[PDB]
């Protein structure tokens, strides 16, 4: 119909004249698509707002990572006769205690790994330990349904906390109050006054086993993640839940508080996510660890460690959410390949040594390579702007 | 206590029962079964027809019996992750 001819300039003036570098690679060239007919009163405004949202997202996923130095194995302590399920470090950073499946709580010397006394008195596997920083006590819990208070001045059990219909999987101590929280298979987290052994609060909101726990002084004070894949933020004053976080798809087995940033990270089989506390606002993913994440430990200098059920170990840069090191745990000689696993882990008080509890009857201690030199120990390479996250 | 039980009832619901050296094995079994169900529910990806827990538990029990009787227990169609998890839990039980 040759109403007009010669796309010769149009076919070039259209493609060329814009920002040369791709901004989000899907930028619709806002100025180019006004001139079509259609429904610009509503659809165009919605499309422009959406384009703004996606460009904001793609730009905000591009934080430059920091170096952070790699980690290496330094000690392999092999004394336990069962899977090591829990670990805690005393506030003075002199010794740490680990429970295991052989009913025993072994107290080790942090600097040397030399075994101090071994505590016995549990009927089944020990699943949680906590050394009180304000009392000379050591609380423990196990699949034998009872929570014990060991007096570390006499190495003897003094208190028993009784109400629990099934095994207990986690134990945490309130930083300020004289109260402790335990959560177990009865789908209930229970709040115990230390002195009177009374179950003041029964935080019953979940539908299945509460596999994780976290306690702090600010509200939310108790954070429980369970088999439901739901994380619940509790109001300890009233014993009622405030916010429920259902972003996870599978059971959330790891909860961890950032020491200095008032945020916490939770992990599950699919993804690791972290939130801002007062409202539980989602703040991003730590993608890359495709394994059953059992542990999460945040350092003081913004380093997060995620240990998996198959021995996979990934160190993350907290700020940028970048996995800067992949490590595979190697079993001690007598074990099977299926025996590679990690159940508990914890940074020591300084944050320079990482303690790992294995499905291997071994405790492994990891140390940053001391030479540093970002030129000689590069992290995993970082590639920006591949695509916006699906979300 | 006697008069309270006379004028009140059992109040049996909501009470716990400690493990008393006769329930140790039967409770250890419950805890192990629950743990294996958890691991099953985790390692299976999304939308893979989750209705498979009972058969895997039967496989685990058969593996334990074969270990007790010193028999290989080598199963043709079992996927590798399930087989590995069963071996892991069987080794735990055997060490106990």
């Amino acid at each position: 119909t040759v109403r007009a001819d010669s796309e010769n300039p149009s076919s070039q003036v259209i493609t060329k004249f814009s920002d040369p570098n791709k901004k989000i690679a899907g930028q619709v060239s806002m100025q180019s698509l006004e001139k079509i007919k259609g429904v610009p009163e509503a659809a165009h405004r919605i499309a422009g707002e959406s384009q703004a949202s996606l460009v904001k997202r793609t730009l905000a996923e591009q934080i430059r990572p920091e170096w952070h130095a790699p980690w290496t194995l330094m000690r392999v302590i092999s004394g336990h006769l069962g899977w090591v399920r829990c670990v805690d470090v005393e506030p003075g950073n002199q010794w740490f205690c680990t429970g295991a499946g052989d009913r025993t709580i072994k107290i080790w010397d942090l600097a040397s790994g030399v075994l101090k006394l071994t505590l016995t008195g549990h009927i089944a596997t020990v699943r949680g330990l906590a050394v009180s920083p304000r009392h000379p006590y050591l609380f423990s819990c196990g699949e034998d349904k009872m929570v014990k208070c060991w007096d570390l001045e006499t190495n003897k059990v003094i208190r028993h906390y009784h109400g629990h219909l099934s095994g207990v999987y986690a134990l945490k101590l309130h930083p300020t109050l004289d109260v402790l929280v335990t959560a177990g298979r009865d789908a209930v987290a229970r709040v115990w006054d230390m002195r009177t052994r009374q179950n003041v609060h029964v935080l019953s909101g979940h539908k299945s086993t509460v596999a994780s726990l976290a306690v702090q002084e600010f509200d939310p004070q108790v954070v429980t993640g369970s088999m439901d894949s739901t994380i619940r933020l509790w109001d300890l004053a009233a014993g009622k839940t405030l916010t429920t976080l259902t972003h996870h798809k599978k059971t959330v087995r790891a909860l961890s508080l950032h020491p200095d940033e008032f945020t916490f990270a939770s992990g599950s089989s699919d993804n690791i996510k972290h939130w801002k506390f007062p409202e539980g606002a989602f703040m991003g993913n730590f993608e890359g660890h495709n394994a059953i994440v059992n542990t999460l430990s945040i350092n003081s200098d913004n380093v997060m460690f995620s240990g998996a059920d198959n021995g996979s170990m990934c160190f993350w840069d907290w700020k940028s959410g970048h996995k800067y090191q992949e490590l595979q745990s190697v079993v001690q000689p007598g074990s099977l390949d299926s025996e590679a696993g990690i159940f508990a882990s914890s940074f020591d008080k300084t944050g320079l040594r990482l303690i790992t509890c294995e499905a291997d009857k071994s405790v492994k201690i990891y140390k940053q390579v001391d030479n540093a030199t970002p030129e000689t120990h590069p992290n995993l390479p970082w590639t920006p702007s591949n695509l916006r996250r699906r979300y | 206590n006697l008069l309270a039980r006379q004028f009140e009832g059992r109040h049996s619901t909501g009470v716990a029962k400690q493990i008393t050296k006769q329930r140790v094995d039967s409770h250890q079994d419950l805890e192990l079964r629950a743990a294996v169900m958890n691991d099953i529910l985790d390692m299976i990806p999304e939308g893979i027809r989750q209705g498979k827990s009972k058969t895997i538990l039967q496989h685990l029990s058969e593996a334990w019996r074969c270990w007790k009787a010193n028999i290989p227990w080598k199963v043709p169609g079992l996927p590798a992750p399930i087989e590995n998890m069963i071996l892991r839990y069987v080794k735990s039980k055997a060490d106990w």
Binding site: S269, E287, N290, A291, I292, D309, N310, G311, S312, D337, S338, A340, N386, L387, R389, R390 | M43, P45, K74, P76, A80, P81, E83, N84, M85
Partner: peptide
């Protein structure tokens, strides 16, 4: 041979190593 016959973007889970 008889024994060997008788017996952005994201990814899926990986678990351990298998030995016959």
């Amino acid at each position: 041979e008889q024994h060997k016959r008788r017996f952005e973007k994201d990814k899926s889970i990986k678990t351990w190593n298998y030995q016959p």
